[PDB]
């Protein structure tokens, strides 16, 4: 990981409204680059290279800056996914967060740092463009775009399946 890669991923986050699919270790590798840029910088200040140091520091600020812009674009896309009930591949840290946004929306419990009503929902691939559908909970799902992965109540997903408009998936 380096600033060149972060420059590419920022360009790619900006160029689509969809969450850019990243290497699972994106965040872990970012931290490394920064721990590595942090040691390399001390290891030059003391060693009296005002130049070699100035460069290690300037790269680090660029890294923090690129990251800031990338995470901002991604969080907003994640918020939209959590609100619209859609799915997309995202790092492990992002699923944790996505789960907290998702918890918040269905009024669950966000931590500090018939036999039951409960509407059963599963993941599906929407095959055609579909307008918002009304679930048994009176909550509406959609609209959806062909190609979207969504978590909707099985009662509706089932109807869409037998209708050739959706297909179950593995989230």
């Amino acid at each position: 990981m380096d600033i060149v890669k972060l420059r590419e991923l920022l360009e790619a986050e900006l160029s689509s409204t969809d969450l850019n699919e990243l290497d699972e270790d994106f965040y872990v590798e970012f931290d490394s680059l920064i721990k590595a840029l942090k040691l390399s910088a001390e290891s030059s200040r003391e060693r009296g290279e005002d130049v070699e140091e100035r460069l290690y520091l300037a790269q680090l600020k660029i890294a923090e800056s690129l990251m800031k812009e990338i995470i901002k674009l991604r969080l907003h896309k994640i918020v939209d996914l959590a609100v619209e009930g859609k799915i997309a591949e995202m790092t492990a840290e992002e699923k944790r967060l996505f789960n907290v946004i998702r918890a918040f929306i269905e009024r669950e419990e966000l931590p500090e740092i018939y036999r039951s009503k409960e509407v059963p929902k599963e993941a599906y691939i929407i095959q055609i463009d579909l307008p918002a559908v009304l679930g048994p909970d009176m909550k509406e799902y959609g609209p959806f775009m062909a190609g979207d992965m969504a978590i909707i109540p099985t009662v509706i997903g089932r109807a869409l399946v037998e209708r050739e408009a959706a297909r179950r998936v593995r989230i």
Binding site: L14, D50, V51, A58, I62, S65
Partner: protein
């Protein structure tokens, strides 16, 4: 006390710099191309000197501005035009504070020209939203791409039109 960062160079543009001292494998007097951010850092510490490409840059924008005001579609911007204009603006800017005036007039022109170019293309994006489309993205700088994508999402959810 407080260092006000200002515009930040991330390396999107390559700047021609003249080496003053033995840094790395570079000898002295020779001309090299570095990333804009590395250009400002080594310049600040007298390791290199900025090859004044303001002449070529100003006239470069003028050509693009001229092309826009001629045929409706948005045009492909030379690689890094925006970022390279920013750098010579930083160069002209901090040149008045060089280390031991015809320039401080050009600084104003480049700024007026860059501003002008972004507005003409912005205004064309606004109107393009009123008629998404992949083709157009392959013609916009990544930041303008973001804008077009956002404009259209707002527009489609309001109007719902084609």
């Amino acid at each position: 006390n407080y260092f006000q960062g200002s515009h930040m160079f991330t390396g999107k543009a390559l700047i021609a710099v003249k080496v003053m001292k033995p840094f790395g494998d570079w000898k002295s007097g020779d001309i090299v191309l570095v990333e804009d951010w590395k250009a400002r850092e080594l310049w600040e510490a007298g390791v290199v000197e900025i090859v004044d490409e303001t002449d070529k840059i100003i006239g470069e924008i003028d050509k693009v501005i001229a092309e826009e005001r001629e045929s409706e579609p948005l045009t492909l911007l030379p690689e890094g035009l925006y970022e390279r204009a920013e750098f010579y603006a930083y160069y002209l800017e901090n040149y008045v504070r060089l280390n031991p005036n015809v320039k401080l007039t050009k600084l104003a022109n480049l700024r007026k020209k860059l501003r002008d170019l972004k507005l003409i293309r912005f205004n064309k994006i606004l109107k393009a939203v009123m008629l998404n489309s992949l083709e157009l993205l392959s013609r916009l700088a990544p930041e303008e791409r973001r804008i077009y994508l956002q404009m259209s999402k707002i527009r489609n959810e309001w109007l719902g039109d084609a």
